[PDB]
């Protein structure tokens, strides 16, 4: 249970200030009703109007002071709890975004979203609901213990000795609550994943008339939650029975012991009555404290996954420290081999060895599934090679600063993604300092996206939806190219960037590759299935089955009959 | 609310059982104190062992019965709340799936998921805590007002003063509380959308190195939520303080009135003193009753978004009953013009007219943004034309039954979308039953069987979320196989060969080998459009 | 005793029935 209390360490001063007010309020609630009764009796008794007015104002002052103390304590407590909730959610999201790339293949989007947004809120609600009640009733019980000691010492000692016997069952039961709550959270996360996956990609669902299948999946996910809720209700009933039985046992045992001693003359009735009168309330407080415990066990159960996220050690090297003032895009592959973490037995790449140099364009071609996108992902430091070295300007990629490296190396992606923001924000995404409107327009002109953006009613301020559905495929690809070009990278990766572009828009890419005056400042890795775009490349590498079979210029590869020649001579 | 009761109607027997158990528990609790007091009197002088045991036994019996009844009541209420929550979730999700495609452009998936996950619990949690307190307070008030008939004139004085004083402020407080709850829910949905977008596009964010930017955005959203929470809590505290002040004032007024009556000989000191305890309990019980009622009303009213979604009528024509046993496959566009509903006054298609015939291949070409995918969407009855008609076998496309229509007219999207699951589930997606041999034949027709055998589990291998664990060409081949499973009469190919290599692309050029289906080909590579019988050129939404 | 005897035995029967049903379940 110690891990739950860790999140409260930041607000210790506020919690102590709240505790002082709690003690004061408990003492007031103990003493004020007694004072009010005495004042009312004296006011009702014989006395002048001055006596009546004096007694009347005292009760009003006491009640107003009690109300003010309660208000101040409530305000402090609620402010502290809100801060705690916000801090916890922020920390959980930050911890989630630090994990390795394959972490997001094992955990799906809806599952992670449910963990981040729902588990943390439930934990915070439980903590804020239970901590104040626990403190309040612990203070009240400690206050009542003094009066119980005053009334009788030995009976208080036997009560205290008997007290630990009531906590044996919940200690042996709480693990069941923990596991049950873990299962409930898992089922809710699965249902959330199903809902998210169905709600996105609605046109695909509609075009195959599969709404009923999605509904059936959702119902199948809900059935497990229903099954767990039945057990939760039964456990609630059983625990509520047991707590009351435990309280009654104490209330009866103390009375039985008192009856015996009153008969033998070892105690006075006047002391026994005033002892039991407060033993009653002490048992009530003990019952409340007993009822708190299963909720604590449930809260421990509900926070297993998020604390696992917080304690997890990422399986990837950390960020470096190098930010060289001047960098040239010299990239060297040295016998690189790779296998995906979820299927480590199968090698996707084997013994790659090639060099990219500034001012030159290198093309990578091959059949589907050869591993070209894997090479692109390795060059962007998304994964680490299982063998060999990959050096940028003579040094390994993990030695550079995270943001500097991704400013120097930029890529487009095979099927580019855009976010639900303005076109201006999409192009300038990820930049530490905002570029001027002149640079964004220049990049859009270079990519060829300026023609259609200027035709929109709001221009560069037009909002696009979360998936870019309001744009066509070619427009989205041009926007992605403009996003890539704005950074002025020294290494440029074009992963099938002309798949959706028409004939007119391919001339922009051709001029960028082989005619722009900015060629000499960057090295280009070109991946495409459009072989006419490859003829002017400085080097051509044919990748088949994860290995490079042929290499050379277009003329050299055409003179030597082989895989590239057969691919080009398709008819 | 009226709607919530009619929704919770299937849970009537459990609510009746809970009410019965609550009544029994109250009955036991109302008599425990008498025997407790008898014990306290017996212990306090003149001890008698016989009568001591009887009082202890009666106390034990009543406590046992009340405890059992209370436990049963709590269990019943908890189960009712859970069942109501699940029913609301199911109905909301079922209603969302029927909306038109324009609805999903306006909204966001993360916000809809937030509505599913957070608003439903707020709706459902109104049963357990409120009902028990309501019934207990009502019973206490009714019982305590009867006892107080010892001084009738003061009671009329009382009911005219203490009761209607609290009505005025609660009208303002309930409105403010409802507004703040609605704002809190909106802020929570906005915060959830940030996580949705950041996690969904993780690889792009990492490729641009923008994780800290997303963290900052999420923290700003959390700060807004925290401010709203603090406002709600502060207002509740102020309301409670004002209630306590009003209760104290009312208490002082009757203390004065009762003391005035006693001096006039209306009642003795004992009657007046016993009157004040009942006064103090009754005021608090009435205040608690009104507070719980207002809280229930505000919590119910704070979730109008779910109710609005659960009853919204989609902007679609009435469902069609057509399902001919035989279909020819002739498609006709008749002066069709279209503008997207989310952005009207910006036409995309302007008076298109063409005919597609079985046994022939038609090619549709044009620049980017010309409107080819819009034509494909209109052909599949995903949108309705603003003018003109789309006909299938001389009848409107919207008059055909939904499952039959999408069984006979099938398409391949521009960027195919796959779902998490096995390969043989993505293939034959949306089919109630499909044999393994049909799946294998369709995979062979799409040239996808070669790479399927290389996977560790064959056709049962798990395709990742959105097909992320496959190459682009493999995903496109799987989409082609999914289309070819249903052997449709009308086939639409929207850039279906963009990601494929030339060797595989040239092998799939024979889309009409049987010659009994209507094929529409949308492409940019003019090599594939050379063999088409009919060629349509689309420029700025107009044929030429 | 303020409570009538018939109500006392009625509650005794209620408690006995509840215990019997709890054991039967
Ligand atoms: N996340 C992943 N986990 C496991 N295997 C994967 C994953 N992504 C891709 N693969 C596999 O790695 C191999 C290479 O895929 P890759 O995307 O690199 O091919 P490609 O050369 O880009 O293909 P294409 O021409 O279709 O674009 C394939 O067998 C593919 O199934
Ligand atoms: N959901 C949408 N809401 C609003 N406008 C849209 C939507 N989808 C597309 N458009 C717009 O409608 C026009 C037609 O786009 P469409 O997707 O039909 O083009 P396309 O001819 O298929 O082009 P491409 O060759 O790039 O695939 C464009 O101006 C586009 O921005
Ligand atoms: Mg690829
Ligand atoms: Mg298109």
PDB file of C-alpha atoms in Angstrom, chain A residues 417-518:
ATOM      1  CA  UNK A 417      -0.039  10.969 -41.575  1.00  0.00           C
ATOM      2  CA  UNK A 418      -1.311  14.475 -40.850  1.00  0.00           C
ATOM      3  CA  UNK A 419      -2.802  15.816 -37.630  1.00  0.00           C
ATOM      4  CA  UNK A 420      -6.046  17.634 -36.918  1.00  0.00           C
ATOM      5  CA  UNK A 421      -4.625  21.163 -36.991  1.00  0.00           C
ATOM      6  CA  UNK A 422      -4.237  24.022 -39.440  1.00  0.00           C
ATOM      7  CA  UNK A 423      -2.243  23.552 -42.633  1.00  0.00           C
ATOM      8  CA  UNK A 424       0.280  26.079 -41.315  1.00  0.00           C
ATOM      9  CA  UNK A 425       0.795  24.063 -38.123  1.00  0.00           C
ATOM     10  CA  UNK A 426       1.080  20.771 -40.020  1.00  0.00           C
ATOM     11  CA  UNK A 427       3.916  22.061 -42.220  1.00  0.00           C
ATOM     12  CA  UNK A 428       5.780  23.593 -39.267  1.00  0.00           C
ATOM     13  CA  UNK A 429       5.156  20.583 -37.004  1.00  0.00           C
ATOM     14  CA  UNK A 430       7.850  19.779 -34.460  1.00  0.00           C
ATOM     15  CA  UNK A 431      10.002  22.888 -34.890  1.00  0.00           C
ATOM     16  CA  UNK A 432      11.385  24.434 -31.706  1.00  0.00           C
ATOM     17  CA  UNK A 433      10.950  27.998 -33.007  1.00  0.00           C
ATOM     18  CA  UNK A 434       8.124  29.024 -35.306  1.00  0.00           C
ATOM     19  CA  UNK A 435       9.221  29.795 -38.883  1.00  0.00           C
ATOM     20  CA  UNK A 436       7.999  32.938 -40.584  1.00  0.00           C
ATOM     21  CA  UNK A 437       5.156  32.836 -43.094  1.00  0.00           C
ATOM     22  CA  UNK A 438       7.733  33.389 -45.850  1.00  0.00           C
ATOM     23  CA  UNK A 439       9.534  30.100 -45.164  1.00  0.00           C
ATOM     24  CA  UNK A 440       6.300  28.091 -45.028  1.00  0.00           C
ATOM     25  CA  UNK A 441       5.180  29.530 -48.365  1.00  0.00           C
ATOM     26  CA  UNK A 442       8.599  28.765 -49.868  1.00  0.00           C
ATOM     27  CA  UNK A 443       8.395  25.144 -48.708  1.00  0.00           C
ATOM     28  CA  UNK A 444       4.849  24.809 -50.055  1.00  0.00           C
ATOM     29  CA  UNK A 445       6.002  26.219 -53.402  1.00  0.00           C
ATOM     30  CA  UNK A 446       8.900  23.752 -53.488  1.00  0.00           C
ATOM     31  CA  UNK A 447       6.628  20.787 -52.759  1.00  0.00           C
ATOM     32  CA  UNK A 448       3.919  21.970 -55.157  1.00  0.00           C
ATOM     33  CA  UNK A 449       1.270  22.213 -52.431  1.00  0.00           C
ATOM     34  CA  UNK A 450       1.028  26.010 -52.712  1.00  0.00           C
ATOM     35  CA  UNK A 451      -1.280  25.849 -55.744  1.00  0.00           C
ATOM     36  CA  UNK A 452      -4.201  24.199 -53.950  1.00  0.00           C
ATOM     37  CA  UNK A 453      -3.629  25.749 -50.511  1.00  0.00           C
ATOM     38  CA  UNK A 454      -4.025  29.293 -51.849  1.00  0.00           C
ATOM     39  CA  UNK A 455      -7.351  28.277 -53.409  1.00  0.00           C
ATOM     40  CA  UNK A 456      -8.906  27.440 -50.049  1.00  0.00           C
ATOM     41  CA  UNK A 457     -11.156  30.071 -48.417  1.00  0.00           C
ATOM     42  CA  UNK A 458      -8.947  30.332 -45.308  1.00  0.00           C
ATOM     43  CA  UNK A 459      -5.635  29.456 -46.970  1.00  0.00           C
ATOM     44  CA  UNK A 460      -2.936  28.264 -44.590  1.00  0.00           C
ATOM     45  CA  UNK A 461      -5.273  28.665 -41.593  1.00  0.00           C
ATOM     46  CA  UNK A 462      -7.707  26.013 -42.853  1.00  0.00           C
ATOM     47  CA  UNK A 463      -8.410  23.344 -40.251  1.00  0.00           C
ATOM     48  CA  UNK A 464      -8.117  19.721 -41.329  1.00  0.00           C
ATOM     49  CA  UNK A 465      -9.679  16.781 -39.529  1.00  0.00           C
ATOM     50  CA  UNK A 466      -7.753  14.337 -37.352  1.00  0.00           C
ATOM     51  CA  UNK A 467      -7.051  11.987 -40.286  1.00  0.00           C
ATOM     52  CA  UNK A 468      -6.803  14.511 -43.126  1.00  0.00           C
ATOM     53  CA  UNK A 469      -9.981  13.147 -44.699  1.00  0.00           C
ATOM     54  CA  UNK A 470     -10.851  16.562 -46.150  1.00  0.00           C
ATOM     55  CA  UNK A 471      -7.763  16.365 -48.386  1.00  0.00           C
ATOM     56  CA  UNK A 472      -7.175  14.062 -51.323  1.00  0.00           C
ATOM     57  CA  UNK A 473      -4.280  11.615 -51.426  1.00  0.00           C
ATOM     58  CA  UNK A 474      -2.031  13.743 -53.615  1.00  0.00           C
ATOM     59  CA  UNK A 475      -2.734  16.886 -51.597  1.00  0.00           C
ATOM     60  CA  UNK A 476      -1.896  15.049 -48.370  1.00  0.00           C
ATOM     61  CA  UNK A 477       1.338  13.703 -49.864  1.00  0.00           C
ATOM     62  CA  UNK A 478       2.333  17.187 -51.058  1.00  0.00           C
ATOM     63  CA  UNK A 479       1.632  18.586 -47.583  1.00  0.00           C
ATOM     64  CA  UNK A 480       3.858  15.879 -46.098  1.00  0.00           C
ATOM     65  CA  UNK A 481       6.637  16.740 -48.559  1.00  0.00           C
ATOM     66  CA  UNK A 482       6.351  20.426 -47.625  1.00  0.00           C
ATOM     67  CA  UNK A 483       6.557  19.405 -43.963  1.00  0.00           C
ATOM     68  CA  UNK A 484       9.756  17.486 -44.712  1.00  0.00           C
ATOM     69  CA  UNK A 485      11.381  20.298 -46.713  1.00  0.00           C
ATOM     70  CA  UNK A 486      10.853  23.112 -44.180  1.00  0.00           C
ATOM     71  CA  UNK A 487      13.595  21.768 -41.897  1.00  0.00           C
ATOM     72  CA  UNK A 488      16.409  22.024 -44.476  1.00  0.00           C
ATOM     73  CA  UNK A 489      17.783  18.581 -43.533  1.00  0.00           C
ATOM     74  CA  UNK A 490      21.198  17.302 -44.538  1.00  0.00           C
ATOM     75  CA  UNK A 491      19.694  13.817 -45.061  1.00  0.00           C
ATOM     76  CA  UNK A 492      16.405  13.450 -46.948  1.00  0.00           C
ATOM     77  CA  UNK A 493      14.392  10.216 -47.152  1.00  0.00           C
ATOM     78  CA  UNK A 494      11.650   9.811 -49.778  1.00  0.00           C
ATOM     79  CA  UNK A 495       9.789   6.554 -49.085  1.00  0.00           C
ATOM     80  CA  UNK A 496       7.565   6.136 -52.162  1.00  0.00           C
ATOM     81  CA  UNK A 497       6.735   9.850 -52.070  1.00  0.00           C
ATOM     82  CA  UNK A 498       5.361   9.881 -55.639  1.00  0.00           C
ATOM     83  CA  UNK A 499       2.773   7.095 -55.305  1.00  0.00           C
ATOM     84  CA  UNK A 500      -0.242   9.440 -55.226  1.00  0.00           C
ATOM     85  CA  UNK A 501       1.127  12.400 -57.213  1.00  0.00           C
ATOM     86  CA  UNK A 502      -0.101  13.074 -60.738  1.00  0.00           C
ATOM     87  CA  UNK A 503       2.088  13.715 -63.773  1.00  0.00           C
ATOM     88  CA  UNK A 504       2.379  17.466 -63.176  1.00  0.00           C
ATOM     89  CA  UNK A 505       3.348  17.126 -59.507  1.00  0.00           C
ATOM     90  CA  UNK A 506       6.143  14.630 -60.246  1.00  0.00           C
ATOM     91  CA  UNK A 507       8.097  17.329 -62.094  1.00  0.00           C
ATOM     92  CA  UNK A 508       8.452  19.144 -58.765  1.00  0.00           C
ATOM     93  CA  UNK A 509      10.122  16.082 -57.241  1.00  0.00           C
ATOM     94  CA  UNK A 510      12.316  15.628 -60.324  1.00  0.00           C
ATOM     95  CA  UNK A 511      13.507  19.245 -60.183  1.00  0.00           C
ATOM     96  CA  UNK A 512      14.067  18.945 -56.430  1.00  0.00           C
ATOM     97  CA  UNK A 513      16.174  15.807 -56.877  1.00  0.00           C
ATOM     98  CA  UNK A 514      18.267  16.689 -59.930  1.00  0.00           C
ATOM     99  CA  UNK A 515      17.914  20.427 -60.673  1.00  0.00           C
ATOM    100  CA  UNK A 516      17.528  22.458 -57.465  1.00  0.00           C
ATOM    101  CA  UNK A 517      20.615  24.414 -56.313  1.00  0.00           C
ATOM    102  CA  UNK A 518      20.153  22.884 -52.835  1.00  0.00           C
TER     103      UNK A 518
END
